[PDB]
Amino acid sequence: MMYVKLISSDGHEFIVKREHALTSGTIKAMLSNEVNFREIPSHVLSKVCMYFTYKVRYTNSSTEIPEFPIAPEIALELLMAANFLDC
Amino acid sequence: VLRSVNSREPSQVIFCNRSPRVVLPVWLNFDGEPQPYPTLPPGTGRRIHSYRGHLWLFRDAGTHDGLLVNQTELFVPSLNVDGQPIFANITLPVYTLKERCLQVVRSLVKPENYRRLDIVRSLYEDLEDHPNVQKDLERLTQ
Amino acid sequence: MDVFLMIRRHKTTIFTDAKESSTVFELKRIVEGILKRPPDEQRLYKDDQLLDDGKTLGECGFTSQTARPQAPATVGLAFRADDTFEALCIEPFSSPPELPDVMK
Numbered sequence A: 001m002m003y004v005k006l007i008s009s010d011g012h013e014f015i016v017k018r019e020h021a022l023t024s025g026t027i028k029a030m031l032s033n034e035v036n037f038r039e040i041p042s043h044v045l046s047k048v049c050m051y052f053t054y055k056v057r058y059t060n061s062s063t064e065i066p067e068f069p070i071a072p073e074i075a076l077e078l079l080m081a082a083n084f085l086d087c
Numbered sequence B: 001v002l003r004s005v006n007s008r009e010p011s012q013v014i015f016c017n018r019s020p021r022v023v024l025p026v027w028l029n030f031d032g033e034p035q036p037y038p039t040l041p042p043g044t045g046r047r048i049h050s051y052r053g054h055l056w057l058f059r060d061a062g063t064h065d066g067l068l069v070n071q072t073e074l075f076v077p078s079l080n081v082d083g084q085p086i087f088a089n090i091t092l093p094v095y096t097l098k099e100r101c102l103q104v105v106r107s108l109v110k111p112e113n114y115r116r117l118d119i120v121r122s123l124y125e126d127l128e129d130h131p132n133v134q135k136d137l138e139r140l141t142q
Numbered sequence C: 001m002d003v004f005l006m007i008r009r010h011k012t013t014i015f016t017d018a019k020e021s022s023t024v025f026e027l028k029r030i031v032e033g034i035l036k037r038p039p040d041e042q043r044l045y046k047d048d049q050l051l052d053d054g055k056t057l058g059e060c061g062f063t064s065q066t067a068r069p070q071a072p073a074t075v076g077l078a079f080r081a082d083d084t085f086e087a088l089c090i091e092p093f094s095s096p097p098e099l100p101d102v103m104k
């Protein structure tokens, strides 16, 4: 299993599957096995990684799709990170 | 262009809301105009009478966010085999992380306060671009 | 049945999935392939409780209901420095800013 490491702006190291991170076109460009995000804090990057798992699991599925939770305190920063990463 | 056909052939269907949203069914009449119908609470079902060749789409009754019916955008009632009515599974789609964030931000700040948020002006324009049935209908016509 | 986990130690977080019927040792083998540390040098925790190698993930409270893709369960990891193990330490994530007045 191939993994990549995404480092937040506060030093937190998130290790995710390679195909999970390749769904973001921006991350795919910075990979071509480590990517540093000078602007994305850990409480935002952890939610981004949770979306990768949520997306891969629930795309093309007849099972009932659950709502992706986003706390209001992180909504603005996550939106800016989602805009930058295009996912 | 994108309208229901006046077939006069009845078709029974069950609108089943498998989503945490209040579902607004939308029927496109014979002139292509969208006609709203009574809303569906989350987890509830409604056995309704429609016709073959009619066009249906479903959306969040509160924010007009797009929804999926039978894993697609448009639901067309077909022929009833052995008297068994058709099932219309209304589910949440896998929103992009960007759009999902816009939904949450839209539900928290008033559209007059979109400018008061500290974001890139491109994101401000994305926030005001509310999901509209008329907008998606032009896009659905390829 | 798949469970979705966050294996955390210090400032390291591993996003991965495993079977509810898989064992704690088999999860240690997953960590081994990622962090290059053998299972005899790792200790896995649910909250503050040590996990037994032979017990399944479902027996240790990791189920599909509690370990969802959008909200994965957290598994604490502790390594062994030479002879003795370290204490379980997990760096918390950064704190989000206060709610703006326009949002409140």
Ligand SMILES: Cc1ncsc1-c1ccc([C@H](C)NC(=O)[C@@H]2C[C@@H](O)CN2C(=O)[C@@H](NC(=O)C2(F)CC2)C(C)(C)C)cc1
Pocket (backbone or CB within 6 Å): B006, B007, B008, B009, B015, B025, B027, B037, B038, B039, B040, B046, B048, B049, B050, B051, B054
């Ligand atoms: C409670 C609830 N919650 C969610 S929906 C719901 C609900 C409520 C009432 C209904 C009624 C009984 N049914 C229809 O509106 C159908 C469905 C659609 O196909 C258009 N239609 C028509 O009858 C059209 N008439 C014809 O087609 C002809 F007779 C061939 C000329 C018009 C011009 C509109 C009268 C259906 C669902």
